[PDB]
Amino acid sequence: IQSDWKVEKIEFAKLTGERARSAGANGRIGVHGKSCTVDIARITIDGQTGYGSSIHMTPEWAEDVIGRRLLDLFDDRGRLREAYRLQLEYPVLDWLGQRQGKPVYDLVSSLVVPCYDTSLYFDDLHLADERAAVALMQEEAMQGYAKGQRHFKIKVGRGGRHMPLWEGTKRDIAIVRGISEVAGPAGKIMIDANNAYNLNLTKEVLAALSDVNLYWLEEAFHEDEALYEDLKEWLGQRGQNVLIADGEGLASPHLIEWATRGRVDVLQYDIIWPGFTHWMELGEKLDAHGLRSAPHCYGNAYGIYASGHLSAAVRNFEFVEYDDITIEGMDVSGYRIENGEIHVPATPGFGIVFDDELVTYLINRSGWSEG
Amino acid sequence: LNITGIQSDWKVEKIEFAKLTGERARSAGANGRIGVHGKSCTVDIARITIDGQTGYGSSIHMTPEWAEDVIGRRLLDLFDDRGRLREAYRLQLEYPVLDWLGQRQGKPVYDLVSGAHLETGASLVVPCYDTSLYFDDLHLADERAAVALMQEEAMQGYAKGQRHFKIKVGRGGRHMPLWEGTKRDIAIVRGISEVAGPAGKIMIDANNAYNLNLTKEVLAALSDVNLYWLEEAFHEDEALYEDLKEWLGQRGQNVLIADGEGLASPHLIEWATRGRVDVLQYDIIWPGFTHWMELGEKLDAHGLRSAPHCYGNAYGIYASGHLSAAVRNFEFVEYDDITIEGMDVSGYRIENGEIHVPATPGFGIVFDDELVTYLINRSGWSEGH
Numbered sequence: 205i206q207s208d209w210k211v212e213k214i215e216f217a218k219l220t221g222e223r224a225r226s227a228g229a230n231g232r233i234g235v236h237g238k239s240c241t242v243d244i245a246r247i248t249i250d251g252q253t254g255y256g257s258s259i260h261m262t263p264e265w266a267e268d269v270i271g272r273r274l275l276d277l278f279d280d281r282g283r284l285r286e287a288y289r290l291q292l293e294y295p296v297l298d299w300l301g302q303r304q305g306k307p308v309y310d311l312v313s314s315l316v317v318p319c320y321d322t323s324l325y326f327d328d329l330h331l332a333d334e335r336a337a338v339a340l341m342q343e344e345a346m347q348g349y350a351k352g353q354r355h356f357k358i359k360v361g362r363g364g365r366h367m368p369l370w371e372g373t374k375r376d377i378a379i380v381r382g383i384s385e386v387a388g389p390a391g392k393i394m395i396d397a398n399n400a401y402n403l404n405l406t407k408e409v410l411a412a413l414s415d416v417n418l419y420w421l422e423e424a425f426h427e428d429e430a431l432y433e434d435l436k437e438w439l440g441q442r443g444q445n446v447l448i449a450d451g452e453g454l455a456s457p458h459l460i461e462w463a464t465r466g467r468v469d470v471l472q473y474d475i476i477w478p479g480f481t482h483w484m485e486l487g488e489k490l491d492a493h494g495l496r497s498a499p500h501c502y503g504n505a506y507g508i509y510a511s512g513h514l515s516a517a518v519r520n521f522e523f524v525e526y527d528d529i530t531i532e533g534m535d536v537s538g539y540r541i542e543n544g545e546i547h548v549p550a551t552p553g554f555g556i557v558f559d560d561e562l563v564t565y566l567i568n569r570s571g572w573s574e575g
Numbered sequence: 576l577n578i579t580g581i582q583s584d585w586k587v588e589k590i591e592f593a594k595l596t597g598e599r600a601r602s603a604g605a606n607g608r609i610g611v612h613g614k615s616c617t618v619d620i621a622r623i624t625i626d627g628q629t630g631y632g633s634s635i636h637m638t639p640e641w642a643e644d645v646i647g648r649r650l651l652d653l654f655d656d657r658g659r660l661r662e663a664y665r666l667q668l669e670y671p672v673l674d675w676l677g678q679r680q681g682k683p684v685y686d687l688v689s690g691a692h693l694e695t696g697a698s699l700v701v702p703c704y705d706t707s708l709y710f711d712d713l714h715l716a717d718e719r720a721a722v723a724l725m726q727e728e729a730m731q732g733y734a735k736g737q738r739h740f741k742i743k744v745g746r747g748g749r750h751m752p753l754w755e756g757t758k759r760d761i762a763i764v765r766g767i768s769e770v771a772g773p774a775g776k777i778m779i780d781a782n783n784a785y786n787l788n789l790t791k792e793v794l795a796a797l798s799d800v801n802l803y804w805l806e807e808a809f810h811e812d813e814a815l816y817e818d819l820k821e822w823l824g825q826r827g828q829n830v831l832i833a834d835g836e837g838l839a840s841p842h843l844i845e846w847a848t849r850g851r852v853d854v855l856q857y858d859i860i861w862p863g864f865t866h867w868m869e870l871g872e873k874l875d876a877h878g879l880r881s882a883p884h885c886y887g888n889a890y891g892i893y894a895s896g897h898l899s900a901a902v903r904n905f906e907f908v909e910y911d912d913i914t915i916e917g918m919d920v921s922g923y924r925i926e927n928g929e930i931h932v933p934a935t936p937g938f939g940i941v942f943d944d945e946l947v948t949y950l951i952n953r954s955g956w957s958e959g960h
């Protein structure tokens with residue numbers, strides 16, 4: 205990177221699409237829907253462009269950044285400075301890989317990465333018949349299986365808000381078993397309560413699912429060291445191997461410490477916020493402790509492909525959280541799902557080919573430009 | 576705070592630190608999330624000497640090396656342009672310093688911080704509540720035996736002049752089977768309600784042991800009880816509290832939502848301004864007294880209520896009483912009956928559900944100079960002279 209290279213232009217557009225199947229409610233909130241959008245920035249440095257997720261960026265913010273040198277955005281250690289990450293880390297890393305003919309997984313390290321189908325929401329809430337609910341949710345897993353998914357995360361916590369407490373929990377249990385039989389003994393099964401349980405409700409559910417191949421338990425309740433210590437001990441005594449997964453949203457400031465003390469196994473900070481640069485630094489610390497990395501990704505299709513590249517820099521990388529989404533102007537065909545794995549194309553940047561012309565249109569129409 | 580009377584000649588001459596020890600009147604059992612709390616109590620205390628006079632108060636996050644840098648500074652230096660003790664000194668020295676100012680000016684802290692313009696004199700009497708009703712019944716298999724004991728514990732408080740009670744619930748979250756535990760919660764609350772009478776304000780505190788539907792089940796079951804607030808039903812979540820507030824509205828059930836202790840969501844206050852949470856409960860020591868005077872002005876401006884959390888630190892109780900003079904929507908002093916050695920709080924009294932704050936200078940707590948000196952030398956530290 206020459207001191208000659210500088211931020212010449214920054215453009216912003218919101219891209220829109222849909223996920224393949226509408227997502228229902230989860231433990232804590234209502235229907236998530238089918239409509240999807242991705243905020244993107246196009247950065248121009250040395251007459252060449254880079255593309256990527258961009259959040260927390262205003263026209264007035266990019267205004268102040270035009271003219272600065274690329275080198276000045278990096279550490280005296282080689283890390284994009286906290287001040288630029290959420291706004292530009294993806295457009296910048298994509299630029300570097302284009303200019304260098306390298307995929308980003310190279311710059312940071314064929315790439316094949318485990319992935320799970322995260323789309324199994326409360327899609328059964330209109331059905332009173334527990335059997336029909338199971339058949340509905342099984343058929344949803346199937347759709348995912350047919351597209352090459354082998355591992356599934358199932359939303360649970362129906363009884364927390366959206367259904368009567370005990371009836372909902374019975375329904376949870378029935379849905380998980382019923383999906384376990386679609387996945388087969390080799391399919392990994394995760395469950396996510398979105399905090400809708402408490403410790404004893406959790407224990408009851410876990411005990412009812414002794415048969416099932418439960419890979420991890422995600423957000424049973426808001427992270428609490430005392431509660432997770434108890435839960436880990438209870439699982440061990442029963443010889444029940446289920447990983448404890450947490451970390452998305454407004455996480456406890458002490459979550460990682462708790463994990464270093466064996467209370468949490470899987471950390472799940474979001475792939476966009478705190479993001480890619482953060483995750484590389486984090487993945488190193490967690491690797492050192494033998495802890496596992498599984499970045500949260502939902503509501504942002506771009507994060508899916510970011511996660512994939514990320515894995516090359518993280519030894520203990522668990523899964524790419526997958527949602528099947530088509531974003532107009534964002535060609536992700538370089539990627540393919542096969543037997544529970546996503547194959548990351550070995551092309552420059554993040555291997556996504558944006559429709560330059562459509563993007564220019566959306567910038568003009570509903571976005572903005574500085575430079 | 577009026578700081579025009581502070582002479583530039585006044586400097587911090589000495590900072591001394593000790594840990595005082597004591598006991599609460601009745602051992603506190605488990606709560607929704609953790610085990611028995613016990614009977615043993617301590618309070619970390621600092622004694623500051625300025626212009627050859629002393630002040631005493633809570634002090635946390637202070638090391639000898641931190642204090643060393645403060646020795647020699649003018650007291651004026653510790654306050655911002657607006658007569659606000661500066662952030663960097665609050666946790667370590669706010670209480671000792673406020674006590675000092677009161678001792679020197681011969682006024683109680685509530686008079687120093689009220690911002691009152693009218694003539695002073697009238698006594699300060701502040702609502703309080705009994706916070707000591709833990710899961711003291713877990714050894715009891717029979718609900719009746721459990722209800723009976725918890726009623727006895729409430730009446731011990733009533734005998735000492737408490738009228739309002741906060742009851743730990745969430746038994747089924749961890750310590751008891753979920754269904755039985757929740758039935759037990761409900762029976763306990765009704766039981767104490769019966770004993771408290773209809774003038775008695777009843778608060779319940781789940782320590783995050785519920786979920787949304789467990790919460791509604793419990794609240795429905797307690798419709799006839801004088802439920803004043805629901806505290807930490809589950810970890811704060813705007814969408815869940817929105818749902819809960821609407822449900823309570825449709826039912827015409829007027830229970831306030833209280834939250835904010837410990838590691839709070841950074842957006843809790845915002846959620847409260849949007850009407851999802853009514854009572855804010857940041858601790859009286861951390862973030863502390865000065866912080867609370869600013870916060871309380873903010874909450875008052877939104878018609879929100881202040882109920883500083885105080886448990887695990889006896890000193891916090893008395894500080895909370897003085898803080899009430901500076902906040903319009905001050906709710907209650909959270910009260911635990913503790914005796915700390917060397918810390919004479921007899922100027923305060925509990926009468927008919929209120930703590931009476933003495934008009935004596937500073938925080939009106941008379942520390943045992945000799946004992947504290949003894950404890951400073953033996954196990955504490957000193958900087959300055």
Ligand SMILES: O=C[C@H](O)[C@@H](O)[C@@H](O)[C@H](O)C(=O)O
Pocket residue numbers: 606706780782836884885886887
């Ligand atoms: O350390 C604190 C205790 O565990 C807890 O039971 C109390 O702080 C309680 O939540 C309260 O409102 O006073």
Ligand SMILES: O=C[C@H](O)[C@@H](O)CC(=O)C(=O)O
Pocket residue numbers: 230233322396398452500501502503525
């Ligand atoms: O935006 C976040 C949604 O409400 C959650 O369902 C996401 C989540 O828990 C996950 O993907 O693991």
Ligand SMILES: [Mg+2]
Pocket residue numbers: 396398422423452
């Ligand atoms: Mg999740």
Ligand SMILES: [Mg+2]
Pocket residue numbers: 423425426427450451452455
């Ligand atoms: Mg969490």
Ligand SMILES: [Mg+2]
Pocket residue numbers: 780782806807836
């Ligand atoms: Mg509480």
Ligand SMILES: [Mg+2]
Pocket residue numbers: 807809810811834835836839
């Ligand atoms: Mg809380």
